Design an enzyme around this catalytic site. Structure first.
Site, short mmCIF file in Angstrom:
data_model
loop_
_atom_site.label_atom_id
_atom_site.label_comp_id
_atom_site.label_asym_id
_atom_site.label_seq_id
_atom_site.Cartn_x
_atom_site.Cartn_y
_atom_site.Cartn_z
N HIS A 22 43.74 67.07 -7.97
CA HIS A 22 43.70 67.24 -6.52
C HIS A 22 44.30 66.05 -5.80
O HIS A 22 44.85 66.22 -4.70
CB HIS A 22 42.28 67.51 -6.07
CG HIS A 22 41.79 68.86 -6.48
ND1 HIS A 22 42.16 70.00 -5.80
CD2 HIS A 22 40.99 69.26 -7.50
CE1 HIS A 22 41.62 71.05 -6.39
NE2 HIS A 22 40.89 70.63 -7.41
N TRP A 92 36.42 70.35 -1.65
CA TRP A 92 36.78 71.18 -2.80
C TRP A 92 35.59 71.42 -3.71
O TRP A 92 35.49 72.48 -4.33
CB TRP A 92 37.88 70.51 -3.61
CG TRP A 92 39.23 70.91 -3.22
CD1 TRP A 92 40.05 70.26 -2.35
CD2 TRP A 92 39.95 72.06 -3.69
NE1 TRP A 92 41.24 70.93 -2.25
CE2 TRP A 92 41.20 72.04 -3.05
CE3 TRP A 92 39.66 73.10 -4.57
CZ2 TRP A 92 42.15 73.01 -3.27
CZ3 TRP A 92 40.62 74.07 -4.79
CH2 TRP A 92 41.84 74.02 -4.15
N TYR A 138 59.30 80.76 -4.92
CA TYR A 138 58.11 80.18 -4.33
C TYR A 138 57.92 78.74 -4.79
O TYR A 138 57.61 77.86 -3.99
CB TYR A 138 56.87 81.02 -4.66
CG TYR A 138 55.64 80.44 -4.00
CD1 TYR A 138 55.32 80.75 -2.68
CD2 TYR A 138 54.84 79.55 -4.67
CE1 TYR A 138 54.19 80.19 -2.06
CE2 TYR A 138 53.73 78.98 -4.06
CZ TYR A 138 53.41 79.31 -2.76
OH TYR A 138 52.31 78.75 -2.18
N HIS A 175 43.94 80.30 -11.76
CA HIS A 175 43.70 79.37 -10.65
C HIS A 175 42.25 78.93 -10.57
O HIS A 175 41.99 77.77 -10.25
CB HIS A 175 44.10 80.00 -9.32
CG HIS A 175 45.53 79.76 -8.98
ND1 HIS A 175 46.24 80.57 -8.13
CD2 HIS A 175 46.38 78.80 -9.40
CE1 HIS A 175 47.48 80.11 -8.04
NE2 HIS A 175 47.59 79.04 -8.80
N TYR A 190 51.13 74.91 -14.49
CA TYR A 190 52.33 74.57 -13.74
C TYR A 190 53.32 73.76 -14.56
O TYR A 190 54.18 73.08 -14.00
CB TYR A 190 51.94 73.83 -12.46
CG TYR A 190 51.32 74.72 -11.41
CD1 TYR A 190 49.95 74.93 -11.39
CD2 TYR A 190 52.09 75.32 -10.42
CE1 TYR A 190 49.36 75.71 -10.43
CE2 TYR A 190 51.51 76.13 -9.46
CZ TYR A 190 50.13 76.31 -9.47
OH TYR A 190 49.49 77.10 -8.54
O1 CZH Z 1 47.48 78.10 -5.61
C1 CZH Z 1 48.41 77.75 -4.89
N1 CZH Z 1 48.48 76.54 -4.21
C2 CZH Z 1 47.53 75.56 -4.25
C3 CZH Z 1 47.69 74.44 -3.49
C4 CZH Z 1 46.73 73.33 -3.49
C5 CZH Z 1 46.68 72.44 -2.42
C6 CZH Z 1 45.83 71.35 -2.45
C7 CZH Z 1 45.01 71.14 -3.55
O2 CZH Z 1 44.13 70.12 -3.55
C8 CZH Z 1 45.05 72.03 -4.62
C9 CZH Z 1 45.89 73.12 -4.58
N2 CZH Z 1 48.80 74.28 -2.71
C10 CZH Z 1 49.69 75.22 -2.70
C11 CZH Z 1 50.92 75.04 -1.86
C12 CZH Z 1 50.60 75.32 -0.42
C13 CZH Z 1 49.62 74.60 0.24
C14 CZH Z 1 49.33 74.85 1.57
C15 CZH Z 1 50.02 75.83 2.26
C16 CZH Z 1 50.99 76.56 1.61
C17 CZH Z 1 51.28 76.31 0.28
C18 CZH Z 1 49.62 76.44 -3.44
N3 CZH Z 1 50.36 77.48 -3.54
C19 CZH Z 1 49.73 78.41 -4.47
C20 CZH Z 1 49.55 79.79 -3.84
C21 CZH Z 1 48.95 80.79 -4.79
C22 CZH Z 1 47.61 81.12 -4.71
C23 CZH Z 1 47.06 82.11 -5.50
C24 CZH Z 1 47.86 82.79 -6.41
O3 CZH Z 1 47.32 83.76 -7.19
C25 CZH Z 1 49.20 82.45 -6.53
C26 CZH Z 1 49.73 81.46 -5.72
O4 CZH Z 1 50.55 78.71 -5.60
O5 CZH Z 1 50.37 77.61 -6.49
#
Ligand code: CZH
Ligand code: NA
Length: 195
Positions: A22, A92, A138, A175, A190
């Site tokens: 994170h 979180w 994406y 996730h 990832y």
């Molecule tokens: O999971 C995902 N993310 C997690 C974090 C994130 C941010 C902060 C953290 O501490 C931890 C994780 N940041 C981003 C990118 C993003 C952030 C904010 C706004 C738009 C995009 C992001 N995109 C996602 C979208 C996604 C979600 C569910 C799915 O099934 C598939 C794809 O795919 O990985």
């Protein structure tokens, strides 16, 4: 013991690998490098940036913005308030605890709805399925996984459907383990993009 109609779920919130994970993402959201982020920045990243460059429709863009909004409010964020990583990480912890409870009770989670929002931008059949090429796009537009090799590792790592495509429910399971519980089965999700 059988737990008597309960399930024991493991969290690992004090593991340095969960903190680094994170922390990596906080730095990625802290674009100006001041150690602070805002809900305002995040939602603008979602709509003004990602959805615009993907050319999502207006309704698709609003659904994504609302899910992003609800997810990071689940971390105690609010528009107009800057937040620093230590309160980000505690958010979180709370979000993950509440999300796991709903998952165990078969109830809707914020992480699933966010997945539904991303997939529906790409999937013309509205079945929550995306292709390697769509994920690569994406990964590059959001910036979370710009390397094509890292994106291929994602599909290599997940279980795919019979045509080699990725389902929203598989990515949601991944996730939960990657962001919430530090499940070893989710390590590598990832590639080398996210520790
Ligand atoms: O999971 C995902 N993310 C997690 C974090 C994130 C941010 C902060 C953290 O501490 C931890 C994780 N940041 C981003 C990118 C993003 C952030 C904010 C706004 C738009 C995009 C992001 N995109 C996602 C979208 C996604 C979600 C569910 C799915 O099934 C598939 C794809 O795919 O990985
Ligand atoms: Na910042």
């Amino acid at each position: 013991m059988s737990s008597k109609y309960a399930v024991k779920l493991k969290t690992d919130f004090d593991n340095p690998r969960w903190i680094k994970r994170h922390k990596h993402m906080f730095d990625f959201l802290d674009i100006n490098g001041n150690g602070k982020i805002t809900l305002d920045e995040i939602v603008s990243k979602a709509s003004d940036d990602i959805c615009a460059k993907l050319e999502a429709t207006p309704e698709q863009t609003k659904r994504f913005q609302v899910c992003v909004e609800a997810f990071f409010r689940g971390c105690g964020m609010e528009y107009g308030k800057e937040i620093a990583f230590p309160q980000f990480l505690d958010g979180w912890k709370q979000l993950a605890t509440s999300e796991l409870k709903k998952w165990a009770r078969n109830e809707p989670t914020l992480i699933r709805e966010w997945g539904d929002a991303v997939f529906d931008i790409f999937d013309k059949d509205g079945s929550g399925t995306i292709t390697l090429d769509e994920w690569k796009a994406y990964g590059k537009i959001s910036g979370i996984s710009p390397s094509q090799e890292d994106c291929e590792a994602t599909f290599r790592h997940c279980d795919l459907d019979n045509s080699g495509d990725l389902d929203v429910d598989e990515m949601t399971r991944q996730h939960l383990g990657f962001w919430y519980t530090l499940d070893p089965e989710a390590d590598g999700l990832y590639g080398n993009g996210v520790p």
